[PDB]
Design a protein around this nucleic acid. Structure first.
Lengths: 97, 50, 552, 545, 698, 51
RNA sequence: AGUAGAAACAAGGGCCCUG
């Protein structure tokens, strides 16, 4: 591995992507957590936090957050990004039976 | 990107594009709706989730 | 700090007004873009004359005020005017000044800790200088250079991306607090974003300039130019100082910023996967997609996914075209027929079957188009502009530079149009074993003849002989081609003109969607077969470096 | 679902497709142009004649079928009622261009070229400014001798010019180049001869009767015959000036490859040839004088400033013998002034006035513009003098372009290296010096024979051509040089036995002869074009005598 | 001796010297013109059939399918036979393929719908229907959206279709308000003012804002069509058309039979705009849009009818004067009728026939075209003629092909005998006369192969680069110090690559540009003896500079650039040698001057002063609105530093984004940064008060 | 850090690694070595008889 | 006076300003 690209593990010349769910001393930055978060149903009770404080939030905890420009959303720190291609392909094949 | 199908292919998977296209042709409606119908189908698929 | 309070007080004053409140309240933020145009609208007919007229004036430069006071820049250093208290009418936050001020600022003004950051901002231009320093210039000569007008790229670039992907790169390398929701690209290529981020973080810079320069950094400038010799971005950036229509400045530029070896490796990998995924007759396509997705390759420092590279690339080659088709990428209006290139200038047609007896009586159906059709062609160091008509080659005009390449181009073209008696009455040698089903898949007649010609030169000579030979009339001796591709002869192939100078490559900025069959036959919304697996090298062994075939 | 929808909404909002149009609900599924009552009322009125409603036109067009028989019949009927003429030039020859008739075209360029007599003074780097140079030249005392006589040799309005010359000399002594507003300056500068606008609401038939009122009777230009003096100016401008370095040029940068050394050697040779002529002296005089006048009109409008007509040059380099390291020189062809240059708008107008020296008798036909004044004597021995006082006018555009007359070098170099590289390529060898020294280029006739001289001496002819194009440019020359190309193409067709043809050449000749008026260059070039076609008729066809 | 410079054409090729004729080294150089245009337009239409409109109640001459007066047809005729035009369209459709036009109108509709209504700002000057003056596109757009807002309610639209439907609704409205130093106008005056087209003498048209979007739609479809065609050269430029011509010539020299022989004809159509009719365009656009979505059918049809009802404005009127020319009266177009007696006989004779059409300061013209409006649709219509082919020609063994761009074409005729060449050319002329397209007989000429001209490019075995055409490009643009020299060098590079400019000419032009640059910006070398402002202080502090080589040209530098280094700005070549003090000072982003294109950003990249003539004119009311928008944009950029580069997007309004972002920044800096709870509370209270005021006010 | 011809050396280094990977010490392409060996002297030659 | 062209300039705005 290398400190430059902290998102790859080379096992016998095979690249194993590490998910970006938690920062490390070298890799620590705003990016190393982005995969962990996801959007969910809006809840106005949860707090509004800073981008830097994202590191401190608990797993499975909701939080509101300003995103980009003129967008206020709700993020829940649970990684739910399944493969989209596989599901669509499988379902579409069934339509042909 | 000169036709709508490419714009839908930018994010949507091409299969749902072809599906919504065939559906629009069967109904005979404008193809401008390839964007909405494809989205409607992908949700359904990713709703199933196997 | 107090500046924050100033911004808030300004916002309060703005909201106290009525019109500003309306325009802020209504609609979304995109209106900003619109508002960005209704202001600062002023152009000038002849800019040169205006600038020369202005510069005579005592104070031709608007400038900031507080920055000048802070920098202790006085109005006059020594009986020389530099600026005077006033307000520019349009801005209302600037003061007139003179150009001399820059010189003073340049020679005794405020100095920053380090200016080496510019070398990163304009990495393209410093790369240009570094490449130029390694060119060993040999010797100017004089001769009438043959130039072909073709589309090329004039900037060596690594990790070429699209406009959509780049926009996030600027936001995620400079303005993170206002970054949009994380995209797929940013997650996939996080080593590049980290590398760019480190250089331009905690630095005093005009952020917009850096973003624009990264935009130019990732844009391969494609131009339609006259060209001679090899085609490499390293040359096209300074072709103006290598040769013209009448002169040539020889120079060796092979070993600078090699960009061709990675294109070659990508095509080799695509060939390998396409040849692997032909085993599964029923589900070759799905196997191909899975094979592409579960593979990657190293580019410089970063490791990139093959699927994205194929989408970005512009190699109009039969190997890549099929893979782009499977993923769904749109591609250029460029046909292929073996190791040959084609481009339909005009015409039309419709399939029409005809029988061919292979040996004695053995009917084999083959389809032939039925209309006039012009076609540019391109074989190695040769080019053509042929035309067909109802299963007949009407004419062919060649402008190449080699005899062997000329013969091969003519033969593959004749095959393309299924002209000649052999298509009516197959050659005796070809048998039913080779006709079809090498691995259980039928091979149409044309590809059988193509393999026949490749197998032996004698077959090629026989095919060319099939086209009628006549006596070279007077005058036309120069525009004639024998069997050995002679410039002139006493007897020559019928209706085979020859000229000097490569035929200019056509151009069209069109994108056609094309599907592919279960047998990897790429249809393009019409009968045409743009590409197939029967126009690739048979097989070869290679040891790929810095690649990842993570599949069982 | 919500992550996918967020991404989708971002990628739609980016493309301006997040609207009801592309994402409508169940009801709002019928988008249509909001056809208004008036738009339809108009569309039903703009229909072609046979139809009377957009519906009929649309129904007739959507089903239109091709009937080639009728289309061919109509095409043949139109092909018979026309009878388009076709005229092969070989049978129907080009009559000679007709030039107008009348008095000789008169000199019009601001600055005299051949006649102008100049005063030189050793260069002072410290004092390099316009006013400072004029002061230095005036102080020696040669200038203070001039004392024009009351009666001029020719011309009109003499007293005004004499008064203004005296005022200029008085100005320099005071070291303030500002002229007062007096009757002479007013008349020459037209300070107050600008018509005062009259409102229409304040008009009546009585006012119309009191002072004549009728649409301005535009006085178009009058025709002038060919100038017999242009050739002399050309021949003189093709000779050396006893000095060099007339026009300012920059330095030569370093070199790394053979190509740059070749470019720098060719450029050095051409610049050496071109810096010694007299035309280039005029290039320098225009660049410097117009630069100074531009920077005065910009700074001191409303003040009838005094600007010199000068230039800077360098004495030639003899052998090492004698005085080495040749010096520089400041020349003073004459003096100019500029009435108020209140250039409120682009392509303005501002009268100027030009005094210039001479040692030659004035022609009546050529020097009609000027109003000469015999002015004492001058050493070289002693020689009479003649003070040529014009009252011309300039604009912004002429200023900017004259200050960029240096363009001629580019065009001439391109033509010469377009001939030399082409001749060198046909042989695949460095043939430039041989081409320059040897290749003979016809440049005229003398004693009924065709003169010829190498290219190295016809670069001067090309340069004069480009310079004069810069000087005399107008609408006439533009139209002419744009319409003469057809004749040259016909000439080429004649040279290569290509049976060219045309539809109505007489009209072409008419168009040409219409745009030949009171501009010496046009008329001279046309006379040469006729002599050319004549000389070629001996070895070619398609032209009548 | 009698010096003659043309003698070089006796023994030297004419192309290799044609550049010498072009006088591009020197400076280049109403109502009477417009009236002559009107007269010629009404004359070309040979017919006399006149309808009477109801909307306007003005006789409307019908310029289509009413041909009469078949005398001297050689001259320009502007009558059109729709049958022939549609037949030619059918021939082109058949050659190109089935459903050729549907794909094109689809590729247009793919853009017209998503297009933003702000892309009308990037256009030539457009007539304003409020002040009655030509004005940049942006100001006119803002003015018409302010009129909309004042009339009924803020324009919620954001796209082209909404804008077009809002213009169509605006035609119906009885009354329309618009801001001014706040007049109101009835429906008829705005109906006339929308169609009115002004003129600029740059002549050229200036259509109203109302028509502009439909014109863009039609041009988009015509462009999408033309790009496909191989017999046109309008969208393309430079090398592409040369390659087209060369391939065409190869095709020709191969197709023709031994008995046959080719010919060329350089053609230059006449009265292109005067003879084109928008009614034929209307029918053609109807035929093209016969299968496509019903949406495009209506949208495309608008612009032709609007142009078919267009008025044309007369500008500046006549001028009156006395004999001595001391006094002088000025009179506008509206008052011409009153002083009909006080004009020359020619002017009266020209004016009197058009009085019936004339309306106040306008002349209703039921047809005709003007320059620049519909370039590509005429190119399509003209490419139609080249395709034509009938049994008679093939029976005689004759065929014509060619390449046409706007009002300039090239013809390649083939036959077996001259008697048939002439007949072929006459047939082509006839088919072109059937659709208004004429041909000039004087400026047009022909010859045996390999001697033509097309758009200032003369052709032979080679193609002589004009060079003259690109000579004006060798000038300092006058943007700033950094931009000018780099742009000039890049221009030299392009001219070198394409127009085969020589190396020595390039070096000479580069030196000319460096010396004109030194002169314009009042700079000169350090070693020179020149005095003045910049040079004096340069000399004062020159001693500090250890390394002379790195010195910048604006700061007493020397030339370190050549033919092999034209693609590299000087700031880069000189970087290593530059001293550290000078380097850091020059490239310090904290610059008052620097304002933000292959160039480096230094202190030299300044902006020029602003004009002040408006200072006296009462054009200030607009400055207030511009300043309002300027302030809003300025502080949105103050918060968001990536507002201009990356287009903002979201669902929040500007105010809400500012409110939330400011509060979040305040919280982040109170957490760690130097802010006190009192200050944080004050800021938050200020924001709450401002929000409440904003919402309550409006 | 301090060098005149970096690119050729770095490309030759990658070439060495790629060749060693192929289990053959040979280098097929001859572009960089040729340059770095010819900077000292490389040029054409004209016969005396053609002089 | 003059320029140039197929019409415009030969200062314009409020005693004061400006390209």
């Amino acid at each position: 591995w290398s400190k430059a690209d902290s998102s790859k593990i080379y096992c016998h010349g095979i690249a194993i992507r590490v998910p970006l769910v938690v920062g490390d001393e070298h890799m620590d930055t705003s990016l190393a957590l982005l995969e962990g978060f996801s959007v969910c149903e809006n809840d106005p009770r949860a707090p509004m936090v800073t981008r830097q404080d994202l590191i401190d939030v608990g797993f499975g905890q909701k939080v509101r957050l300003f995103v980009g420009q003129g967008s206020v959303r709700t993020f829940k720190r649970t990684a739910s990004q399944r493969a989209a291609s596989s599901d669509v392909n499988k379902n579409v094949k069934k339509i042909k039976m | 990107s000169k036709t709508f199908a490419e714009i839908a292919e930018a994010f949507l998977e091409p299969e749902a594009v072809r599906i919504a296209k065939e559906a629009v042709e069967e109904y005979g409606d404008h193809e401008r709706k390839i964007i909405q119908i494809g989205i409607h189908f992908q949700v359904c698929c990713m709703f199933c989730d196997e | 700090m107090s500046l924050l309070l100033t911004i808030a007080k300004e916002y309060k004053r703005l909201c106290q007004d009525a019109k500003a409140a309306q325009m802020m309240t209504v609609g979304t933020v995109s209106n900003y873009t619109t508002f960005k145009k209704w202001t600062t609208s002023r152009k000038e007919k002849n800019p040169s004359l205006r600038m020369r007229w202005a510069m005579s004036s005592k104070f031709p430069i608007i400038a900031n005020k507080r920055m000048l006071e802070e920098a202790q820049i006085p109005k006059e250093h020594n009986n020389v005017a530099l600026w005077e208290d006033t307000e520019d009418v349009s801005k209302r936050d600037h003061v007139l000044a003179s150009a001399s001020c820059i010189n003073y600022w340049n020679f005794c003004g405020p100095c920053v800790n380090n200016s080496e950051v510019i070398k990163e901002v304009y990495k393209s231009r410093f790369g240009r200088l570094e490449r130029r320093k390694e060119i060993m210039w040999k010797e100017l000569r004089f001769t009438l250079v043959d130039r072909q007008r073709r589309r090329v790229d004039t900037q060596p670039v690594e990790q070429r991306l699209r406009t959509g992907e780049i926009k996030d790169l600027q936001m995620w390398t400079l303005f993170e607090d206002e970054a949009p929701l994380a995209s797929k690209f940013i997650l996939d290529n996080y080593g590049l974003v980290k590398e760019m981020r480190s250089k331009f973080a905690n630095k005093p810079l005009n952020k917009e300039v850096v973003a624009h320069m990264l935009e130019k950094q990732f844009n391969p400038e494609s131009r339609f130019l006259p060209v001679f010799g090899a085609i490499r971005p390293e040359r096209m950036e300074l072709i103006h100082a290598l040769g013209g229509e009448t002169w040539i400045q020889e120079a060796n530029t092979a070993g600078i910023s090699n960009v061709d070896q990675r294109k070659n490796d990508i095509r080799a990998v695509c060939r390998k996967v396409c040849l692997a995924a032909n085993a599964s007759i029923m589900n070759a396509k799905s196997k191909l997609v899975e094979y592409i997705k579960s593979t990657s390759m190293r580019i410089g420092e970063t490791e990139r996914k093959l699927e994205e590279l194929i989408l970005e690339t512009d190699d109009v080659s039969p190997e890549v075209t099929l893979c782009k088709s499977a993923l769904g990428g749109q591609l250029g209006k460029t046909l292929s027929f073996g190791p040959m290139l084609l481009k339909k200038i005009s015409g039309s047609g419709v399939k029409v079957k005809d029988t061919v007896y292979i040996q004695g009586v053995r009917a084999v159906q083959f389809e032939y188009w039925s209309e006039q059709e012009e076609f540019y062609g391109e074989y190695k160091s040769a080019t053509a502009l042929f035309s067909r008509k109802e299963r007949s080659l009407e004419w062919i005009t060649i402008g190449g530079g080699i005899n062997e390449d000329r013969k091969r181009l003519l033969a593959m073209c004749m095959i393309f149009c299924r002209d000649g008696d052999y298509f009516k009455d197959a050659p005796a040698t070809i048998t039913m074993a080779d006709l079809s089903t090498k691995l259980g898949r039928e091979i149409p007649y044309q590809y059988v003849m193509m393999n026949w010609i490749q197998k032996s030169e004698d077959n090629l000579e026989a095919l060319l002989y099939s086209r009628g030979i006549v006596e070279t009339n007077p005058g036309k001796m120069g525009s004639s081609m024998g069997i050995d591709g002679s410039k002139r002869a006493i007897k020559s192939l019928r209706a085979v003109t020859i000229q000097s100078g490569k035929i200019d490559m056509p151009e069209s900025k069109e994108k056609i969607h094309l599907e592919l069959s279960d047998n990897l036959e790429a249809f393009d919304s019409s009968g045409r077969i743009v590409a197939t697996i029967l126009d690739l090298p048979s097989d070869k062994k290679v040891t790929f470096q810095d690649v990842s075939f993570q599949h069982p | 679902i919500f992550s996918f929808l967020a991404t989708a909404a971002d990628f739609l909002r980016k493309e301006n497709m997040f609207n009801e149009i592309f994402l409508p609900d169940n009801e709002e599924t019928i988008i249509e142009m909001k056809k208004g009552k008036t738009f339809l009322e108009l569309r039903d009125e703009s229909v072609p004649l046979p139809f009377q409603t957009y519906e009929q036109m649309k129904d007739y067009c959507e089903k239109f079928k091709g009937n080639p028989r009728e289309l061919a019949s109509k095409v043949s009927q139109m092909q018979s009622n026309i009878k388009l003429p076709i005229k092969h030039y070989e049978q129907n020859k080009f009559r000679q261009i007709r030039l107008p008739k009348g008095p000789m075209a008169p000199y019009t360029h601001k600055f005299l070229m051949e006649e102008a007599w100049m005063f030189t003074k050793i260069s002072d780097p410290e004092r390099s400014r316009a006013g400072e140079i004029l002061i230095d030249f005036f102080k020696k005392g040669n200038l203070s001798a001039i004392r024009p006589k009351d009666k001029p040799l020719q011309g009109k309005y003499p007293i005004h010019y004499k008064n203004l010359w005296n005022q200029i000399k008085a100005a320099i002594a005071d070291r303030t180049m500002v002229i007062n507003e007096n009757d002479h300056s007013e008349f020459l500068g037209g300070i107050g001869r600008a018509s005062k606008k009259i409102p229409e609401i304040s008009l009546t038939q009585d006012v119309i009767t009191t002072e004549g009122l009728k649409q301005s009777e535009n006085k178009l230009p009058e025709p002038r015959s060919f100038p017999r003096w242009f050739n002399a100016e050309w021949m003189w401008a093709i000779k050396d000036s006893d000095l060099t370095g007339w026009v300012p040029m920059a330095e030569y940068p370093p070199a790394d490859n053979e190509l740059e050394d070749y470019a720098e050697h060719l450029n050095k040779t051409m610049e050496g040839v071109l810096q010694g002529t007299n035309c280039a002296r005029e290039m320098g005089k225009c660049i410097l004088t117009v630069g100074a006048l531009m920077t005065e009109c910009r700074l001191f409008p409303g003040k009838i400033k005094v600007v010199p007509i000068y230039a800077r040059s360098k004495e030639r380099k003899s052998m090492q013998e004698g005085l080495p390291v040749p010096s520089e020189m400041d020349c003073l062809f004459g003096i100019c002034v500029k009435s108020k240059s209140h250039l409120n708008k682009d392509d303005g107008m501002y009268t100027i006035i030009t005094f210039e020296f001479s040692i030659r008798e004035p022609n009546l036909e050529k020097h009609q513009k000027y109003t000469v004044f015999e002015a004492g004597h001058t050493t070289v021995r002693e020689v009479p003098l003649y003070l040529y006082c014009r009252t011309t006018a300039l604009s912004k555009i002429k200023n900017d372009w004259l200050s960029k007359a240096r363009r001629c070098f580019i065009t001439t170099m391109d033509t010469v290296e377009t001939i030399c590289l082409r001749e060198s390529a046909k042989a695949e060898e460095n043939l430039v010096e041989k081409t320059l020294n040897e290749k003979q280029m016809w440049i005229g006739k003398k004693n009924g024979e065709l003169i010829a001289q190498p290219l190295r001496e016809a670069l001067r002819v090309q340069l004069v051509q480009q310079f004069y194009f810069c000087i005399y440019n107008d609408s006439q020359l533009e139209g002419f040089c744009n319409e003469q190309k057809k004749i040259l193409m016909a000439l080429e067709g004649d040279k290569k036995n290509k049976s060219s043809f045309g539809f109505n050449p007489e009209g072409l000749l008419e168009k040409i002869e219409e745009c030949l008026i009171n501009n010496p260059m046009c008329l001279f070039m046309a006379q040469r074009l006729n002599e050319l076609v004549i000389e070629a008729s001996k070895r070619g066809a398609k032209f009548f005598k | 001796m009698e010096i003659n410079p043309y003698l070089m054409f006796l023994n030297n090729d004419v192309t290799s010297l044609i550049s010498t004729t072009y006088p591009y080294t020197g400076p280049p150089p109403s109502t009477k013109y417009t009236l002559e245009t009107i007269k010629r337009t009404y004359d070309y239409s040979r017919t006399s059939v006149e309808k009477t409109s109801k909307v306007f109640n003005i006789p409307r001459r019908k310029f289509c399918n009413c041909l009469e007066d078949k005398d001297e047809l050689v001259k320009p005729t502007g009558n059109v036979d729709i049958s022939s035009l549609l037949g030619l369209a059918e021939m082109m459709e058949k050659r190109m393929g089935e459903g050729f036009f549907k794909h094109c109108v689809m590729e247009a509709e793919t853009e017209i719908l998503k297009m933003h209504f702000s892309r009308l700002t990037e256009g030539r000057q457009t007539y304003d229907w409020t002040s009655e003056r030509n004005m940049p596109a942006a100001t006119a757009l803002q003015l018409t959206v302010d009129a909309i807002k004042e009339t009924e309610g803020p324009f919620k639209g954001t796209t082209m279709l909404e804008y077009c439907n809002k213009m169509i609704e605006m035609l119906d409205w009885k009354e329309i308000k618009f801001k001014k130093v706040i007049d109101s106008i009835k429906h008829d005056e705005f109906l006339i003012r929308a169609l009115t087209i002004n003129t600029m003498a740059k002549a050229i048209a200036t259509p109203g804002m109302i028509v502009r979007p439909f014109s863009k739609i039609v041009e988009t479809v015509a462009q999408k069509i033309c790009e496909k065609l191989k017999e046109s050269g309008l969208p393309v430029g430079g090398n592409e058309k040369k390659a087209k011509l060369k391939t065409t010539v190869t095709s020709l020299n191969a197709r023709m039979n031994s008995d046959q022989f080719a010919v060329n004809i350089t053609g230059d159509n006449s009265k292109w705009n005067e003879c084109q009719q928008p009614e034929a365009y209307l029918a053609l656009l109807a035929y093209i849009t016969k299968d496509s979505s019903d949406l495009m059918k209506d949208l495309c049809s608008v612009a032709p009818v609007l142009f078919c009802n267009k008025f044309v404005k007369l500008g500046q009127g006549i001028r009156l004067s006395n004999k001595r020319k001391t006094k002088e009266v000025i009179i506008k177009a509206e008052k011409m009728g009153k002083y009909k007696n006080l004009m020359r006989e020619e002017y009266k004779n020209l004016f009197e026939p058009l009085e019936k059409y004339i309306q106040k300061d306008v002349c209703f013209l039921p047809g005709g075209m003007l320059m620049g409006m519909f370039n590509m649709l005429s190119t399509v219509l003209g490419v139609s003629t080249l395709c034509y082919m009938d049994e008679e020609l093939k029976a005689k063994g004759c065929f014509w092909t060619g390449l046409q761009s706007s009002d300039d074409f090239v013809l390649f005729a083939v036959a077996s005998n001259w008697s048939n060449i002439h007949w072929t050319i006459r047939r082509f002329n006839a088919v072109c006369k059937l659709i208004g397209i004429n041909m000039s007989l004087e400026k047009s000429y022909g010859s045996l192969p390999e001697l033509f001209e097309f758009t200032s490019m003369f052709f032979d075995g080679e193609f002589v680069s004009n060079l003259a055409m690109e000579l004006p490009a060798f000038t300092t643009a006058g943007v700033n110090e950094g931009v000018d020299f780099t742009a000039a060098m890049s221009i030299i590079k392009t001219n070198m690559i394409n127009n085969s400019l020589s190396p020595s000419t390039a070096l000479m032009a580069l030196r000319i540009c460096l010396q004109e640059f030194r002169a314009t910006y009042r700079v000169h070398p350090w070693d020179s003896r020149v005095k003045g402002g910049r040079m004096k202080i340069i000399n004062e502090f020159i001693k500090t500079i250890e390394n002379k080589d790195g010195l910048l040209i604006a700061d007493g530098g020397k030339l370190m650039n050549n033919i092999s280094t034209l693609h590299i700005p000087e700031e880069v070549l000189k970087f290593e040698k530059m001293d550290e003090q000078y380097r850091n000072r020059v490239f310090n982003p904290k610059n008052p001057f620097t304002n933000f294109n292959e160039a480096v950003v230094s202190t030299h990249s300044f902006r020029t002063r602003a004009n002040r003539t408006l200072l006296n004119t009462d054009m200030r009311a607009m400055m207030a609105e511009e300043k309002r928008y300027q302030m809003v944009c300025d502080m949105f950029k103050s918060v968001f530093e990536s507002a201009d580069i990356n287009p903002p997007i979201g669902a929040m309004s500007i105010g809400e984004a500012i409110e939330e972002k400011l509060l979040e920044r305040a919280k982040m800096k109170r957490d760690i940064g130097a802010i006190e709870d009192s200050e944080y509370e004050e800021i938050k209270d200020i924001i709450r008060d401002a929000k409440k005021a904003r919402l309550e006010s409006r």
